[PDB]
Amino acid sequence: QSQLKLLVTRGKEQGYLTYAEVNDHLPEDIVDSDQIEDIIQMINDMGIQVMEEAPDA
Amino acid sequence: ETLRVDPTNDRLSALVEIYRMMRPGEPPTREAAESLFENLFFSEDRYDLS
Amino acid sequence: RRRKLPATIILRALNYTTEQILDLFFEKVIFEIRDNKLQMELVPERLRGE
């Protein structure tokens, strides 16, 4: 709900891939080097369908 | 509106929330949660506008 | 430069309760309930553009 709706509706497509945005809109203990690669992988490349593979993951 | 989206309700929950935002890991205490926030904007050895 | 929090969380961190927070940004409006009715401290200047 929260993460899913916020991510999708915001990113359309955030133009210059505003990375420093929704990462603050995420729970749990922040400043990690683990959750980073899991957002840079979805946004571009396999667009449209990649954004539906993300939530299900 | 800002108060409407504020999880914290007192001084302990606030300083602890800051302590969990800055140093996400160890369980927030009383001394640590307070000393950190004091050593951010209220300490000469940790803050200075010159 | 970290993740966002409602900017009243630091106020509570400075030992400010919610009511005090409200009495530091806004102008209060007092209402009286006398003679079984509702009155209001009317200020003409405030009624601009309403």
From Swiss-Prot, chain A:
Coiled coil: none annotated. It comes from the Bacteria. It is found in: Cytoplasm. Residues 1-57 are annotated as: Sigma-70 factor domain-1. Sigma factors are initiation factors that promote the attachment of RNA polymerase to specific initiation sites and are then released. This sigma factor is the primary sigma factor during exponential growth. Preferentially transcribes genes associated with fast growth, such as ribosomal operons, other protein-synthesis related genes, rRNA- and tRNA-encoding genes and prfB. Belongs to the sigma-70 factor family. RpoD/SigA subfamily. Interacts transiently with the RNA polymerase catalytic core formed by RpoA, RpoB, RpoC and RpoZ (2 alpha, 1 beta, 1 beta' and 1 omega subunit) to form the RNA polymerase holoenzyme that can initiate transcription. Identified in a complex containing RpoD, the RNA polymerase subunits RpoA, RpoB and RpoZ, CRP and DNA. Interacts with Rsd; this prevents interaction with the RNA polymerase catalytic core and with promoter DNA, and as a consequence, promotes transcription from promoters that require alternative sigma factors. (Microbial infection) Interacts with Escherichia phage lambda antitermination protein Q. Contains 4 domains, connected by flexible linkers. In the active conformation, the domains are in an extended conformation, each making extensive interactions with the RNA polymerase catalytic core. In the autoinhibited state, sigma-70 factor domain-1 packs closely together with sigma-70 factor domains-2 and -4, contrary to the extended conformation that is seen when the protein is part of the RNA polymerase holoenzyme. This is RNA polymerase sigma factor RpoD. It comes from Escherichia coli (strain K12).
Curated annotation (Swiss-Prot), chain B:
Co-administration of salinamide and rifampicin or salinamide and myxopyronin suppresses the emergence of resistance to both antibiotics. Acetylated on several lysine residues in the presence of glucose. Transmembrane segments: none annotated. DNA-dependent RNA polymerase (RNAP) catalyzes the transcription of DNA into RNA using the four ribonucleoside triphosphates as substrates. Resistance to the antibiotics salinamide A, salinamide B, rifampicin, streptolydigin, CBR703, myxopyronin, and lipiarmycin can result from mutations in this protein. The RNAP catalytic core consists of 2 alpha, 1 beta, 1 beta' and 1 omega subunit. When a sigma factor is associated with the core the holoenzyme is formed, which can initiate transcription. The rRNA transcription and antitermination complex (rrnTAC) consists of RNAP, NusA, NusB, NusE (rpsJ), NusG, SubB, ribosomal protein S4, DNA and precursor rRNA; S4 is more flexible than other subunits. In pull-down experiments interacts with CedA. Belongs to the RNA polymerase beta chain family. This is DNA-directed RNA polymerase subunit beta. The gene is rpoB. The chain holds residues 349 to 398 of 1342 of the full protein.
